[PDB]
Design an enzyme around this catalytic site. Sequence first.
Site, PDB file in Angstrom:
ATOM      1  N   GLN A  88      38.791  40.533  45.704  1.00 10.86           N
ATOM      2  CA  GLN A  88      39.328  38.896  45.913  1.00 10.86           C
ATOM      3  C   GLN A  88      38.061  39.304  43.533  1.00 10.86           C
ATOM      4  O   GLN A  88      38.483  38.817  42.524  1.00 10.86           O
ATOM      5  CB  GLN A  88      38.770  37.963  46.501  1.00 10.86           C
ATOM      6  CG  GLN A  88      39.350  37.351  45.695  1.00 10.86           C
ATOM      7  CD  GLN A  88      38.900  35.679  46.412  1.00 10.86           C
ATOM      8  OE1 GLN A  88      39.097  34.165  46.469  1.00 10.86           O
ATOM      9  NE2 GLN A  88      38.826  35.743  48.079  1.00 10.86           N
ATOM     10  N   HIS A 115      39.719  39.683  40.031  1.00 11.24           N
ATOM     11  CA  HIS A 115      39.395  38.616  39.457  1.00 11.24           C
ATOM     12  C   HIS A 115      38.391  38.194  38.277  1.00 11.24           C
ATOM     13  O   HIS A 115      38.277  37.674  37.564  1.00 11.24           O
ATOM     14  CB  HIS A 115      38.151  37.504  40.033  1.00 11.24           C
ATOM     15  CG  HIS A 115      39.332  36.920  40.919  1.00 11.24           C
ATOM     16  ND1 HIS A 115      39.675  34.747  40.952  1.00 11.24           N
ATOM     17  CD2 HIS A 115      40.964  37.359  41.654  1.00 11.24           C
ATOM     18  CE1 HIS A 115      41.077  34.930  41.979  1.00 11.24           C
ATOM     19  NE2 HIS A 115      41.833  36.046  42.007  1.00 11.24           N
ATOM     20  N   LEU A 155      51.764  42.296  42.424  1.00  9.99           N
ATOM     21  CA  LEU A 155      51.445  42.655  42.998  1.00  9.99           C
ATOM     22  C   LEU A 155      50.304  42.939  43.511  1.00  9.99           C
ATOM     23  O   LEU A 155      49.872  42.900  45.114  1.00  9.99           O
ATOM     24  CB  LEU A 155      51.927  43.970  42.764  1.00  9.99           C
ATOM     25  CG  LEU A 155      50.677  44.863  41.925  1.00  9.99           C
ATOM     26  CD1 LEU A 155      49.438  45.867  42.456  1.00  9.99           C
ATOM     27  CD2 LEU A 155      51.859  46.217  41.828  1.00  9.99           C
ATOM     28  N   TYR A 156      49.087  42.322  43.063  1.00  9.95           N
ATOM     29  CA  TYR A 156      47.512  41.960  44.215  1.00  9.95           C
ATOM     30  C   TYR A 156      47.706  40.209  44.592  1.00  9.95           C
ATOM     31  O   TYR A 156      46.566  40.658  44.582  1.00  9.95           O
ATOM     32  CB  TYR A 156      46.471  42.485  43.115  1.00  9.95           C
ATOM     33  CG  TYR A 156      45.639  43.015  43.015  1.00  9.95           C
ATOM     34  CD1 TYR A 156      46.023  44.605  42.342  1.00  9.95           C
ATOM     35  CD2 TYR A 156      44.873  43.058  44.186  1.00  9.95           C
ATOM     36  CE1 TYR A 156      44.940  45.639  42.563  1.00  9.95           C
ATOM     37  CE2 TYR A 156      44.029  43.814  44.195  1.00  9.95           C
ATOM     38  CZ  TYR A 156      43.805  44.890  43.997  1.00  9.95           C
ATOM     39  OH  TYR A 156      43.493  46.461  44.094  1.00  9.95           O
ATOM     40  N   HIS A 162      47.340  37.926  49.682  1.00  5.35           N
ATOM     41  CA  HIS A 162      47.627  36.374  50.346  1.00  5.35           C
ATOM     42  C   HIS A 162      47.115  37.001  51.589  1.00  5.35           C
ATOM     43  O   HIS A 162      46.219  36.085  52.898  1.00  5.35           O
ATOM     44  CB  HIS A 162      47.850  35.364  49.975  1.00  5.35           C
ATOM     45  CG  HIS A 162      47.168  34.733  48.334  1.00  5.35           C
ATOM     46  ND1 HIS A 162      47.579  35.131  47.236  1.00  5.35           N
ATOM     47  CD2 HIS A 162      46.048  34.284  48.048  1.00  5.35           C
ATOM     48  CE1 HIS A 162      46.848  34.420  46.706  1.00  5.35           C
ATOM     49  NE2 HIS A 162      46.310  33.655  46.492  1.00  5.35           N
ATOM     50  N   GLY A 197      51.538  49.792  42.333  1.00  2.00           N
ATOM     51  CA  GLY A 197      49.237  49.461  41.986  1.00  2.00           C
ATOM     52  C   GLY A 197      48.574  50.370  41.595  1.00  2.00           C
ATOM     53  O   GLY A 197      48.033  50.217  40.649  1.00  2.00           O
ATOM     54  N   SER A 245      46.396  50.917  38.604  1.00  3.09           N
ATOM     55  CA  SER A 245      45.268  50.797  38.992  1.00  3.09           C
ATOM     56  C   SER A 245      44.144  52.034  38.591  1.00  3.09           C
ATOM     57  O   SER A 245      43.513  51.997  37.708  1.00  3.09           O
ATOM     58  CB  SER A 245      45.205  50.778  39.937  1.00  3.09           C
ATOM     59  OG  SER A 245      43.654  51.656  41.154  1.00  3.09           O
TER      60      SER A 245
HETATM   61  C1  COH Z   1      42.625  39.923  46.426  1.00  5.81           C
HETATM   62  C2  COH Z   1      43.009  39.592  47.703  1.00  5.81           C
HETATM   63  C3  COH Z   1      43.120  38.280  47.470  1.00  5.81           C
HETATM   64  C4  COH Z   1      42.175  36.911  48.252  1.00  5.81           C
HETATM   65  C5  COH Z   1      41.441  37.886  49.371  1.00  5.81           C
HETATM   66  C6  COH Z   1      42.630  35.531  48.042  1.00  5.81           C
HETATM   67  C7  COH Z   1      41.751  34.883  48.263  1.00  5.81           C
HETATM   68  C8  COH Z   1      42.242  33.671  48.234  1.00  5.81           C
HETATM   69  C9  COH Z   1      41.367  32.721  48.260  1.00  5.81           C
HETATM   70  C10 COH Z   1      40.507  32.607  49.189  1.00  5.81           C
HETATM   71  C11 COH Z   1      39.202  32.640  49.550  1.00  5.81           C
HETATM   72  C12 COH Z   1      41.608  31.290  47.775  1.00  5.81           C
HETATM   73  C13 COH Z   1      41.439  29.859  48.169  1.00  5.81           C
HETATM   74  C14 COH Z   1      42.657  31.239  46.849  1.00  5.81           C
HETATM   75  C15 COH Z   1      42.892  30.778  45.378  1.00  5.81           C
HETATM   76  C16 COH Z   1      43.359  31.051  44.498  1.00  5.81           C
HETATM   77  N1  COH Z   1      44.311  32.387  43.951  1.00  5.81           N
HETATM   78 CO1  COH Z   1      43.419  34.295  45.726  1.00  5.81          CO
HETATM   79  N2  COH Z   1      43.398  36.109  46.858  1.00  5.81           N
HETATM   80  C17 COH Z   1      43.561  37.186  46.173  1.00  5.81           C
HETATM   81  C18 COH Z   1      44.478  37.086  45.418  1.00  5.81           C
HETATM   82  C19 COH Z   1      44.746  36.844  44.006  1.00  5.81           C
HETATM   83  C20 COH Z   1      45.069  36.966  42.667  1.00  5.81           C
HETATM   84  C21 COH Z   1      45.007  38.629  42.313  1.00  5.81           C
HETATM   85  C22 COH Z   1      45.068  36.208  42.483  1.00  5.81           C
HETATM   86  C23 COH Z   1      45.589  36.162  40.719  1.00  5.81           C
HETATM   87  C24 COH Z   1      44.339  35.664  40.144  1.00  5.81           C
HETATM   88  C25 COH Z   1      44.835  34.586  38.443  1.00  5.81           C
HETATM   89  O1  COH Z   1      45.959  34.967  38.159  1.00  5.81           O
HETATM   90  O2  COH Z   1      44.286  34.075  37.817  1.00  5.81           O
HETATM   91  C26 COH Z   1      45.174  35.095  42.833  1.00  5.81           C
HETATM   92  C27 COH Z   1      45.022  33.638  42.381  1.00  5.81           C
HETATM   93  C28 COH Z   1      44.942  32.529  43.220  1.00  5.81           C
HETATM   94  C29 COH Z   1      44.487  31.203  42.491  1.00  5.81           C
HETATM   95  C30 COH Z   1      45.191  31.064  41.000  1.00  5.81           C
HETATM   96  C31 COH Z   1      46.286  30.222  41.225  1.00  5.81           C
HETATM   97  C32 COH Z   1      47.500  30.924  40.956  1.00  5.81           C
HETATM   98  O3  COH Z   1      48.665  30.758  39.844  1.00  5.81           O
HETATM   99  O4  COH Z   1      47.855  32.215  40.389  1.00  5.81           O
HETATM  100  C33 COH Z   1      44.131  30.355  43.523  1.00  5.81           C
HETATM  101  C34 COH Z   1      43.442  29.116  43.272  1.00  5.81           C
HETATM  102  N3  COH Z   1      44.743  35.344  44.392  1.00  5.81           N
HETATM  103  N4  COH Z   1      42.514  32.850  46.290  1.00  5.81           N
HETATM  104  C1  LIG Z   2      42.446  46.934  35.335  1.00  9.20           C
HETATM  105  C2  LIG Z   2      42.187  47.850  37.126  1.00  9.20           C
HETATM  106  C3  LIG Z   2      41.426  48.419  37.259  1.00  9.20           C
HETATM  107  C4  LIG Z   2      41.621  48.318  38.335  1.00  9.20           C
HETATM  108  C5  LIG Z   2      42.669  48.345  39.041  1.00  9.20           C
HETATM  109  C6  LIG Z   2      41.660  48.114  40.516  1.00  9.20           C
HETATM  110  C7  LIG Z   2      42.322  47.761  41.757  1.00  9.20           C
HETATM  111  C8  LIG Z   2      42.689  48.911  42.086  1.00  9.20           C
HETATM  112  C9  LIG Z   2      43.106  49.322  43.792  1.00  9.20           C
HETATM  113  C10 LIG Z   2      44.067  49.236  44.814  1.00  9.20           C
HETATM  114  C11 LIG Z   2      46.321  49.105  43.176  1.00  9.20           C
HETATM  115  C12 LIG Z   2      46.635  48.553  44.488  1.00  9.20           C
HETATM  116  C13 LIG Z   2      47.031  49.520  44.881  1.00  9.20           C
HETATM  117  C14 LIG Z   2      47.087  50.012  45.658  1.00  9.20           C
HETATM  118  C15 LIG Z   2      47.656  51.150  45.183  1.00  9.20           C
HETATM  119  C16 LIG Z   2      46.579  52.521  44.414  1.00  9.20           C
HETATM  120  C17 LIG Z   2      45.321  52.599  45.579  1.00  9.20           C
HETATM  121  C18 LIG Z   2      45.806  52.783  47.243  1.00  9.20           C
HETATM  122  C19 LIG Z   2      46.054  54.124  47.237  1.00  9.20           C
HETATM  123  C20 LIG Z   2      46.895  55.157  46.321  1.00  9.20           C
HETATM  124  C21 LIG Z   2      46.179  56.314  45.963  1.00  9.20           C
HETATM  125  C22 LIG Z   2      46.231  57.188  44.325  1.00  9.20           C
HETATM  126  O1  LIG Z   2      47.322  57.757  44.348  1.00  9.20           O
HETATM  127  O2  LIG Z   2      45.662  56.721  43.803  1.00  9.20           O
END
Ligand code: COH
Ligand SMILES: CC/C=C\C/C=C\C/C=C\C/C=C\C/C=C\C/C=C\CCC(=O)O
Lengths: 551, 552
Positions: free
Chosen positions: A172, A176, A353-354, A357, A495, A499
């Site tokens: 996260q 971000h 894809l990222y 949640h 991804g 990535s």
């Molecule tokens: C990596 C995994 C991950 C986690 C653990 C996580 C955990 C949490 C979490 C609890 C701790 C909260 C309260 C939020 C809250 C939010 N998430 Co994420 N999110 C995650 C991946 C993402 C990603 C990537 C985005 C897109 C960011 C953007 O578009 O700004 C996202 C979008 C959001 C947004 C922007 C709204 C939108 O429309 O995209 C908020 C606010 N959420 N997130």
């Molecule tokens: C601006 C982008 C820079 C970095 C990207 C950030 C994170 C990438 C991590 C995961 C990507 C999303 C999903 C999984 C994909 C690849 C990782 C896991 C396995 C694949 C291994 C490989 O073949 O590279």
Amino acid sequence: HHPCCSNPCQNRGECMSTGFDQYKCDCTRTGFYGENCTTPEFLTRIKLLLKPTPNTVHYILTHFKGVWNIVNNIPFLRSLIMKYVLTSRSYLIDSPPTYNVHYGYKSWEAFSNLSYYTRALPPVADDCPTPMGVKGNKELPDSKEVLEKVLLRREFIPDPQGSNMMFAFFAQHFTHQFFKTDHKRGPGFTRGLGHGVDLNHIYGETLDRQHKLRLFKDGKLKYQVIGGEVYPPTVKDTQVEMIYPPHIPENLQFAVGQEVFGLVPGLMMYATIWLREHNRVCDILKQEHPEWGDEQLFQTSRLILIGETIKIVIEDYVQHLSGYHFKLKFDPELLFNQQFQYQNRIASEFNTLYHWHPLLPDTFNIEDQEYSFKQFLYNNSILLEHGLTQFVESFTRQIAGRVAGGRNVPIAVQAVAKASIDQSREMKYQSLNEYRKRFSLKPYTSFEELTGEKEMAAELKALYSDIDVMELYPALLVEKPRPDAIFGETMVELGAPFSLKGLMGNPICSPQYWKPSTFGGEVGFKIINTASIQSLICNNVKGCPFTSFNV
Amino acid sequence: HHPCCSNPCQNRGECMSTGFDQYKCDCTRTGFYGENCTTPEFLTRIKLLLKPTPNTVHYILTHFKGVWNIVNNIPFLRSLIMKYVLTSRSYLIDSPPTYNVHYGYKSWEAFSNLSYYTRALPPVADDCPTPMGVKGNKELPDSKEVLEKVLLRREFIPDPQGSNMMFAFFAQHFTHQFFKTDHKRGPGFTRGLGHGVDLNHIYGETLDRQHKLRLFKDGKLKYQVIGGEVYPPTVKDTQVEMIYPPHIPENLQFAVGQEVFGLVPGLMMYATIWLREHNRVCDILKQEHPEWGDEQLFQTSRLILIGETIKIVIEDYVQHLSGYHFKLKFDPELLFNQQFQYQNRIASEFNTLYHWHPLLPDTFNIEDQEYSFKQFLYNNSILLEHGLTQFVESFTRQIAGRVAGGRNVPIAVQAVAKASIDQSREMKYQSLNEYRKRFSLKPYTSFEELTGEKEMAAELKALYSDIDVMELYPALLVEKPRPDAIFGETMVELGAPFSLKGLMGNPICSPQYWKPSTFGGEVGFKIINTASIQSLICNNVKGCPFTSFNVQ
Ligand code: COH
Ligand SMILES: CC/C=C\C/C=C\C/C=C\C/C=C\C/C=C\C/C=C\CCC(=O)O
Ligand code: COH
Ligand SMILES: *[C@@H]1O[C@H](CO)[C@@H](O[C@@H]2O[C@H](CO)[C@@H](O[C@H]3O[C@H](CO)[C@@H](O)[C@H](O)[C@@H]3O)[C@H](O)[C@H]2NC(C)=O)[C@H](O)[C@H]1NC(C)=O
Ligand SMILES: *[C@@H]1O[C@@H](CO)[C@@H](O[C@@H]2O[C@H](CO)[C@@H](O)[C@H](O)[C@H]2NC(C)=O)[C@H](O)[C@H]1NC(C)=O
Ligand SMILES: *[C@@H]1O[C@H](CO)[C@@H](O[C@@H]2O[C@H](CO)[C@@H](O)[C@H](O)[C@H]2NC(C)=O)[C@H](O)[C@H]1NC(C)=O
Ligand SMILES: *[C@@H]1O[C@H](CO)[C@@H](O[C@@H]2O[C@H](CO)[C@@H](O)[C@H](O)[C@H]2NC(C)=O)[C@H](O)[C@H]1NC(C)=O
Ligand SMILES: CC/C=C\C/C=C\C/C=C\C/C=C\C/C=C\C/C=C\CCC(=O)O
Ligand SMILES: CCCCCCCCO[C@@H]1O[C@H](CO)[C@@H](O)[C@H](O)[C@H]1O
Ligand SMILES: CCCCCCCCO[C@@H]1O[C@H](CO)[C@@H](O)[C@H](O)[C@H]1O
Ligand SMILES: *[C@@H]1O[C@H](CO)[C@@H](O)[C@H](O)[C@H]1NC(C)=O
């Protein structure tokens, strides 16, 4: 309506209308020809018969542990395999970038405007008779229905790969810096104009913000000392804008690079760690170069941290995700004799894809306490009360949720998951199957095939009617995972290319950057090449706790 | 002072302070090793033994006319040579870019901030004992003195290559899309954030400016029709900001993409031609695609004109400059099996070397009229009175001045020539010999070697004292020219790599763009691949007058 609505062109051919009801496909360098680029060239036909399916390559890399132990310990062999890994996946990304939410054909506006996320597939034209083009019903199934029937968490499903909260909050925090959606403009727009790993989430997007966060002594960032412990400075002392609800005391309104990082204590943990790390690097460089001023100390430290990030992300973070026995290597030198563009542009689809949640647990377990979402959000006093050491020890132990497999999105984030479906539609995303073809995957021929199961498939069947109109995002969360894996095929095969481009496409990986003088000499270079998630915590968290990305 | 002031590191090694009094060279991938990256490796010894001098390479290309006539008519041979021309030159450029005026070390500010011109060579540190490092006097010679003695024009020296005013104004028009110094900010800063051939000088730098210039019908640009002739729209009509002095009335205030193109009628000529060209392409595309809306028409026309520009710059403009018998080719397919970065960052030194003020004549001859600088400046009445047909005819036949060889800067622009020297100095430029080494050239051992002549070389030594402190800009204008050529060695060997990188590094040359579909099909693609300076004029100027970059 637009003649290309049916997406007639195959194999990365390009569709162009040649009249109101006529189209022409551009088959240039696809390896195919004919009206729709469907007939393969002789070279291509043999190449197709030999290419192993993604699931076969996954099997090899996650089995034969005895052979991989040998390969991992032969530098020449490890490098060779890593070189193929990098090159084979980089090729799937358009670089220089092409389409965006507003341009389903190449244009200078699409290229030059960094405010847009780029697009791996052009948007569906506005006048198409169907949301996905020609197939399916006039409306997609209600997004709330999809969410509730196949996405929302019934019972918590732990990740079989052992992913922990240390990993979840890393993902996260890290992602971000390049997923910073500009809501004032729209979901197809970004505030992260660096389009990659520039560490703006530590340093600030603009220079104006960076300078408020800097100490201007010894190259360091500003900080406060609470109970002998180094923390980020306040909003008040820096005049740096952060997102905070008004009820939160001035004391706990921490100012860091990214405006949203006060939302979650887990993000603030890594914000503190990286702040400490930058100041630790400043101390090291100040000793190596007592002759250097503040500006160079700061700048040089930044590049070193960019290096640490890419190193940790590949060799710890991606390594853990992969499930491979093969040891992934961060070595820019592997591409020096290869054709590779040292530039990146963040794809909207990479962002979508990222949305992992499901990773989020029902409660956040720190020490003996179990905090609910309401208790946890915006609460920085939890971090202060427990301390970083406890935070690391606890989150290393708490398992995260399985992303694929269906039905694991926590209810606290239902509105965000619904939003991910809605904004996909607003941005006119093409179908899952179109994205699969785009990334050299055989398209799913049924909902059972996608889900590997029967109940969710049946629900999805009644909602969408046709597999060829299944949407990308819900499909990634319902997809059949790989054996004991966190993700399914589509997540990985899309991804990984996105990535790796963003990681290796960084300027610091280019030959003219990848040398010890860039980082203040061998000492600075050493910091990068031995960086790990364990060393990051050990150097910056009191009592050097053990940590990893798995329980 | 800084330990790297003497520029100790050779052969492209990088200097780094390792204490108050000591340094370290980073010799990574230079092909050399040792304290100052001077000891050559075995492979490097072989490479330095087999590689010919740039003077030898120039001789072969400017001689053997009959042989090149065969070479130019066998497509395989022509493609093979053009491939080497592009590659052997492109390794000389840091891409991604490195330094700028504020950063003598690689940093994220330097890489990420597009407001800077990049730097092929880091600036001399602030605390250095002499302006050039350690060599020379505490102060450089008065810039006025250098200008008056060896730069200012006495008798007009025509370009022996035959470059005309059509060439001179094309150079000025074309380069002013990427040389757009931000004077409120400083000489090291640019306003052309596209850092290359984006045609912002036609379409505007910002979206708001583009939108004021567009017609929003058939993908066209706004225009007016005066006496049956298509001209740019006005400032009053578009609300587009332009640099015009008070005395210039509403009618003669044409609005174009670049805010300074009203300065010279010569520039407005090209601005008018290109505006006509865009709208001509729109018509072609409309016929191919009756289903297409305004936005796509405009966008793909822009992409075509970007292509046309690069085509004309390589196969007419650079071709003419080079003086080669070998026919240069614009073909992106040549780089598809090569390591090449499709990105560019305009270098400050590229801007500096492009201050070709000696090209300018004493007067501007149009029909029977010879206009002085005072008469020509800011005077678009001249354009309307004579028309574009007479402008092309007159400028095609008027000869330009020789850039190298010394003493050829017109007095009318003397303050500008002085500014180039003064701004190089405040931007803390390194010496000529340092830039020569930076580009794989042997440093000049004397001022007489620099000029190939006695008189100026004496004047220069009396001012600079040491050859190793000669500045880059005045050196380019006084340099011994190649035989019967417009430029000397330094100009070409610095200019050519910056140029080709700027042209080929455009995203339209990348494999994913270099397709007929990018340009609306095969017809749009053919417009790029058959573009020339003559067709540009022939298609858009009444009567289709004959033109080229030489007389006549
Ligand atoms: C990596 C995994 C991950 C986690 C653990 C996580 C955990 C949490 C979490 C609890 C701790 C909260 C309260 C939020 C809250 C939010 N998430 Co994420 N999110 C995650 C991946 C993402 C990603 C990537 C985005 C897109 C960011 C953007 O578009 O700004 C996202 C979008 C959001 C947004 C922007 C709204 C939108 O429309 O995209 C908020 C606010 N959420 N997130
Ligand atoms: C601006 C982008 C820079 C970095 C990207 C950030 C994170 C990438 C991590 C995961 C990507 C999303 C999903 C999984 C994909 C690849 C990782 C896991 C396995 C694949 C291994 C490989 O073949 O590279
Ligand atoms: C390419 C050849 C060429 C020609 C023919 C030419 C012809 C002329 C000319 C008569 C037609 C006049 C009156 C000038 C006068 C000027 N030149 Co040029 N210049 C040329 C090359 C350049 C370049 C390149 C720059 C840098 C542009 C910038 O923005 O710094 C320049 C800078 C300038 C500037 C300062 C930039 C500004 O923003 O004002 C002035 C004034 N001059 N020049
Ligand atoms: C990158 O793309 C963005 C989206 O197109 C663009 O923002 C848009 O900017 C235009 C013009 O600056 C705005 O349009 C406005 O134009 C008239 C001019 O008379 C104004 O009166 C109105 O406010 C009108 O909206 C758009 O509002 C704006 N689009 C948005 C906010 O999504 C960026 O400018 C582009 N980036 C660059 C650097 O060019
Ligand atoms: C690497 O650096 C050069 C200077 O750039 C040179 O150092 C100088 O040597 C001169 C005699 O050749 C001395 O006059 C002078 O004292 C010295 N300059 C310094 C160190 O400030 C070194 O010889 C050269 N090293 C090698 C290995 O040749
Ligand atoms: C290229 O694709 C088009 C459209 O997808 C094909 O046209 C279709 O042909 C199939 C089978 O004959 C029919 O099911 C469709 O009715 C046809 N068009 C449409 C709009 O449905 C075309 O045959 C393909 N070209 C070739 C030669 O493979
Ligand atoms: C690129 O660099 C310039 C120069 O450092 C930045 O402009 C400065 O911005 C600060 C803070 O916003 C102002 O106080 C100064 O007036 C500016 N300095 C000038 C005009 O020389 C510019 O912000 C940087 N660009 C980006 C994208 O951050
Ligand atoms: C973004 C910049 C892109 C293009 C710049 C365009 C034109 C530059 C033209 C001249 C620059 C000055 C000197 C050398 C220029 C061209 C090469 C001329 C002769 C050598 C031919 C060659 O070896 O390519
Ligand atoms: C805890 C939040 C889940 C609320 C689900 C409301 C929508 C009903 O969804 C139903 O859920 C059932 C239980 O898994 C499934 O058996 C059905 O297939 C599904 O349609
Ligand atoms: C015909 C002019 C060619 C010889 C001039 C070289 C000597 C420079 O002479 C200078 O000329 C400038 C232009 O008028 C004046 O502004 C200066 O005062 C004058 O000293
Ligand atoms: C914040 O955390 C504290 C413990 O540090 C907890 O007791 C309190 O209830 C939390 N605040 C809110 C508003 O939930």
